[PDB]
């Protein structure tokens, strides 16, 4: 199926996946710039390290975080698109090889469709899917009040990545679309800002609720 | 003719093994040939020399 050269690809430079560079990737907002990591690294695989260290996620490549995020099952105790996706033995959890292949295919599809760096498109998608305000309860006197609060950049990034992964899983669930195709569509739509993307829809909903409870 | 009150010879089954210390069935620990009831082994192990370094 796939060409033998691609099967036995041998990188020679230090760039993400050995195919895409990060020299020209730009982050606009100053809030997420410190946490959005574009360090030169051809293997986005840090194993389980940086979990123990507090604030250790600021030094993990974007692709590694996305791979870890998509390495899951979806659903479980939460409903997205109004359905559970409790897949136990068919899940990608604990399958980093499969998650890596999925991310690679999604990046290839994004590059083919858009003509731009897939990592740059992912940065745009994360920016557009990052919320800025939420609602939380505060306990004073003897009663609680709902109050609108800000979101730290780390939580913004985590929520954006989680929303992208859940959206891709939801639109690949029990359909004819492959998981890589679903991920590529999610990233493209999130970058394009159309409400069709689950990440952007959730960001808009969170912001609207924050405004209402403001 | 008085052949009764006799136990039939059994080669296998829960009736072919007795706890040497108390004479019991179900269970018998026969790891390494101990053939010791589980309670008896629990209360006797320190004398036999086993230690719980867990």
């Amino acid at each position: 199926a796939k060409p033998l050269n691609e099967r036995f690809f041998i990188p020679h430079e230090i760039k993400v996946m050995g195919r895409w560079s990060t020299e020209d990737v730009e982050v606009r907002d100053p809030s997420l710039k410190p946490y959005i990591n574009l360090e030169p690294r051809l293997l986005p695989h840090t194993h389980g390290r940086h979990a123990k260290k507090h604030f250790g996620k600021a030094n993990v490549h974007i692709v590694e975080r996305l791979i870890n995020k998509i390495m899951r099952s979806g659903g479980s105790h939460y409903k997205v698109a109004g359905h559970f996706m409790r897949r136990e033995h068919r899940s990608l959890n604990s399958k980093k090889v499969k998650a890596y292949e999925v991310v690679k295919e999604a990046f290839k599809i994004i590059e083919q469709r858009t003509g731009k760096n897939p990592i740059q498109v992912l940065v745009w998608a994360i920016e557009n899917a990052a919320p800025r305000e939420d609602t939380t309860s505060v306990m004073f006197g003897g009663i609680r009040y709902h109050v609108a609060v800000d979101i730290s950049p780390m939580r913004r990034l985590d929520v954006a990545l989680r929303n992208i992964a859940l959206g891709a899983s939801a639109k690949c669930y029990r359909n004819k679309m492959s998981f890589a195709e679903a991920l590529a569509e999610e990233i493209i739509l999130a970058a394009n800002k159309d409400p069709k993307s689950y990440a952007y829809s959730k960001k808009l909903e969170i912001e609207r609720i924050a405004e209402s409870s403001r | 003719k008085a052949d009764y009150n006799k136990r039939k010879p059994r080669k296998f089954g829960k009736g072919a093994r007795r706890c040497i210390r108390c004479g019991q069935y179900g269970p018998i620990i026969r790891i390494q040939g101990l053939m010791l009831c589980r309670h008896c082994f629990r209360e006797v192990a320190p004398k036999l020399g086993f230690r719980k370094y867990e």
Binding site: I10, P11, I14, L42, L43, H45, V97 | -
Partner: protein, 134 residues
């Protein structure tokens, strides 16, 4: 002249011998170029790319790995190869480059498996059966 190095990960032990040659790196009798999966191949190959093309072509390495899974064996081979290159070159610039890239290349990973305990030992140490109450 030969130099020997060792690497360990999980339960995989890799012994590497580095010598001067044409740059043909062989692992367990197989060329490194046809190693699968691609993730494992990249893991093994990273130190050579970091060192550079000239050193890669100058020196050749023979590695023997035993124990562990494919990822563990790849990590052990990576550690052994990195140590062999550092010792052979004898320069501190690439050593600092290795430190700033991935500190664990020259320093092994001390993590090991936590022993299982009762109440679903087979599941794992902290795994347990769910209660029922009423």
């Amino acid at each position: 002249r030969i130099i020997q190095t060792t690497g360990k990960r999980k339960t995989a032990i890799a012994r590497a011998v580095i010598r001067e040659g044409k740059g043909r790196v062989r692992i367990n009798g197989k060329p490194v170029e046809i190693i699968e999966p691609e993730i494992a191949r990249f893991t093994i190959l990273e130190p050579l790319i970091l060192a550079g093309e000239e050193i890669w072509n100058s020196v050749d390495i023979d590695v023997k790995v035993e124990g562990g899974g494919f990822m563990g064996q790849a990590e052990a081979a990576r550690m052994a190869i990195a140590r062999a290159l550092v010792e052979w070159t004898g320069d501190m610039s690439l050593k600092e480059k290795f430190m700033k890239y991935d500190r664990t290349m020259l320093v092994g990973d001390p993590r090991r498996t936590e022993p299982h305990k009762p109440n679903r030992s087979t599941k794992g140490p902290r795994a347990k059966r769910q209660k029922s109450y009423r």
